[PDB]
Amino acid sequence: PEGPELHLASQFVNEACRALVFGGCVEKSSVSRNPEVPFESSAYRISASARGKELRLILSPLPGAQPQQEPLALVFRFGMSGSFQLVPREELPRHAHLRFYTAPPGPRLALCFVDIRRFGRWDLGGKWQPGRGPCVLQEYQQFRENVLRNLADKAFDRPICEALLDQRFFNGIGNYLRAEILYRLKIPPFEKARSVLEALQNPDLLELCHSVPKEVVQLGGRGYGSESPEEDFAAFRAWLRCYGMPGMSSLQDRHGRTIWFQGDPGPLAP
DNA sequence: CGTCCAGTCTAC
DNA sequence: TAGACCTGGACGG
């Protein structure tokens, strides 16, 4: 998942938990190498916000809750397969590595961090990853300024397709967005990043870094819609113009990740 | 049955 | 920079 999936995951947590009350401990699977969450409360509400490719949960005990406890924040990174689900308490999915449990009265549910491949991570601080840049979706102007003031960075020496995955400058862009973004402007992927960016200093590359992900968010779905996984998966394939599509070229960047593009590979190509 | 394919993080 | 971390689905024999 990329910035749009993290954003939709946070909206899912806010809408699904709006009328729920959690109680008890936060339970971690025995196979997860992530930290135990030291939190217990007889009555707490869960809420969420996204920033780039990170999501922050806030656990908020109600007035009167026991034990006495301040709100607790956790920050998640989803890696390749992270997600959130709200399921019946006895119908936990196979890779539910972190679990929050509704309290009575009402149907006993669990909000679960589900992560098949366990590349995802959580941290006890409620702090965003030091060094990640501002959110291309929610901090557009900060995102733009942070790129254009730092074009000197050796990061922008690299091909534009590699620069676009550097989460210090493009927090929330991943493999499918970089393909989709470059294709809208027909910018060869192995053009030099500083060349393409010096040139701004008819939307431009940094505008699309915001507006293209924003399209996926408006689309909805990505496992957080009411509609089926069949309907979701199709809606998304239909939106895609470049990533994975018939008629499109693909190469490996310096990190063995696949870039999709039409036409000129660009000067710095393998 | 087998190979191959799909975001960080860290040891060299 | 390679290799490491993981599981599962698609496809080949």
Numbering used by the authors: 2 to 202, 222 to 290
Published text:
This mechanism involves two mutually competing interaction states: an activated state that commits catalysis and BER, and a quarantine state that temporarily separates and prevents the flipped base from catalysis via auto-inhibition.
In order to destabilize the quarantine state, we rationally designed hNEIL1(R242, G249P) and hNEIL1(R242, Y244H) to disrupt the flexibility of the loop or the aromatic stacking interactions respectively. Instead of the quarantine state originally observed in hNEIL1(R242)–FDHU structure, we found that both two mutants switched to the activated state as expected. Our study reveals that instead of utilizing a specific pocket to tightly recognize a flipped base via extensive electrostatic and hydrogen bonding interactions, hNEIL1 uses two competing interaction states to achieve substrate recognition.
